[PDB]
């Protein structure tokens, strides 16, 4: 018997009397409010605790904002007997549910922005408190994120591979911001980049001072140090990413 | 309430396969990375294996990796180490974990421990 009525969901028993209180409906679980019956949506308190509704009226378990922060709404039993869906407890530790990551502080909320913990910077999602991953735009610097943290080196934004270079390599950068790096090659960790003057990393065939080189779509690394199938081609490389002339 | 409980040890000899179970209850652990780690005789406990309850993630130690593999079953909120090529230094306590608490996995920072069982590789 459940309808929306006037964008509101009772459930009928077949009864003039819509349902009150919790209601387990085809393995979901509803709470509806004991004066108007109505099912409770988004954050919402039950006899003087916390839980969370989406919009249809289902329970979450998972990490979603009430009114001071993220809270954890946890299983069953989790912390002090909670009751499922329940917020817990959970203070100054990561916690993990499925592939996300969250830290939690003091106060048992998610934190949200950037935030130092045991001397690592991370950046969780604003909306979601979830770890930061692949390349976000914060404050209008520019970061290539994996697990929350940002990485160093050369990835691929939307507008094509930038430097995301360690603190101080350029204007004072921070650790993991990308750089103004023009019309240079990068030498780093054993791979070889040209930047060009728009500070992105070329890819795919190239002249450069006389010299060819390819730099792999994918990573943008020249190929180097011997031979490489191409398209369908094979080519030789010198150390230094110089195609020797001549097929092979 | 909440309890780990690993099962499947025992006698294996080297070359051979086993596969340890750890079946968790009085929670579900459906959301929660679960783990293996081993005490070794006369050394300290070590970590073995790790994984999201996708199996999306997962690490293992370097003394077990391509050897050993972690898999779930979140229906049985149950956790498995697939060991295989069985060496005599595989002899061990093994213990499950659940629900790591640390900035990784490979850290003994885990809510929920096991009973630890005994796996024992002869010759």
């Known amino acids: 018997g459940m309808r929306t009525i006037d964008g509101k969901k009772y459930y009928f028993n077949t009864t003039a009397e819509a349902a009150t209180g919790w209601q387990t409906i085809d393995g979901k679980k509803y709470y509806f409010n004991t004066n108007t019956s109505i099912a409770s949506t988004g954050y919402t308190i039950i006899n003087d605790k916390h839980f969370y509704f989406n919009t249809d009226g289902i329970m979450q378990i998972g990490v979603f904002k009430g009114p001071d922060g993220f809270e954890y709404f946890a299983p069953a039993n989790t912390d002090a007997n909670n009751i499922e869906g329940q917020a817990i407890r959970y203070q100054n530790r990561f916690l993990y549910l499925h592939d996300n990551i969250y830290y939690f502080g003091n106060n048992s909320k998610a934190a949200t922005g950037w935030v130092t913990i045991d001397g690592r910077r991370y950046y969780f999602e604003p909306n979601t408190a979830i770890g930061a991953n692949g390349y976000k735009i914060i404050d209008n610097k520019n970061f290539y994120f994996r697990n929350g943290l940002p990485q160093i080196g050369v990835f691929k934004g939307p507008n094509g591979f930038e430097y995301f270079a360690p603190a101080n390599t350029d204007a004072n950068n921070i650790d993991g911001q990308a750089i103004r790096y023009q019309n240079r090659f990068l030498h780093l960790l054993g791979n070889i980049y040209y930047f060009g003057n728009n500070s992105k990393a070329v890819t795919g065939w190239q002249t450069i001072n006389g010299n060819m080189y390819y730099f792999m779509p994918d990573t943008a690394m020249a190929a180097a140090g011997g031979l490489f199938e191409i398209d369908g081609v094979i080519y030789f490389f010198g150390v230094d990413g110089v195609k020797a002339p001549g097929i092979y | 309430q909440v309890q780990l409980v690993e099962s499947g040890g025992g006698l294996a000899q080297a070359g051979g396969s086993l596969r340890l179970s750890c079946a968790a209850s009085g929670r579900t652990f459906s959301m929660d990375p679960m783990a293996w780690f081993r005490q070794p005789p006369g050394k300290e406990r070590e970590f073995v294996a790790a994984g999201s309850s996708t199996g999306r993630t997962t690490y293992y130690a370097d003394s077990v990796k391509g050897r050993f593999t972690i898999s779930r079953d979140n229906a049985k909120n149950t956790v498995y180490l697939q060991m295989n090529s069985l060496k005599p230094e595989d002899t061990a306590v093994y213990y499950c974990?659940?629900?790591?608490?640390?900035?990784?996995?490979?850290?003994?920072?885990?809510?929920?421990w096991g009973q630890g069982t005994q796996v024992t590789v002869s010759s």
């Open positions: 974990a659940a629900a790591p608490y640390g900035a990784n996995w490979y850290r003994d920072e885990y809510a929920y």
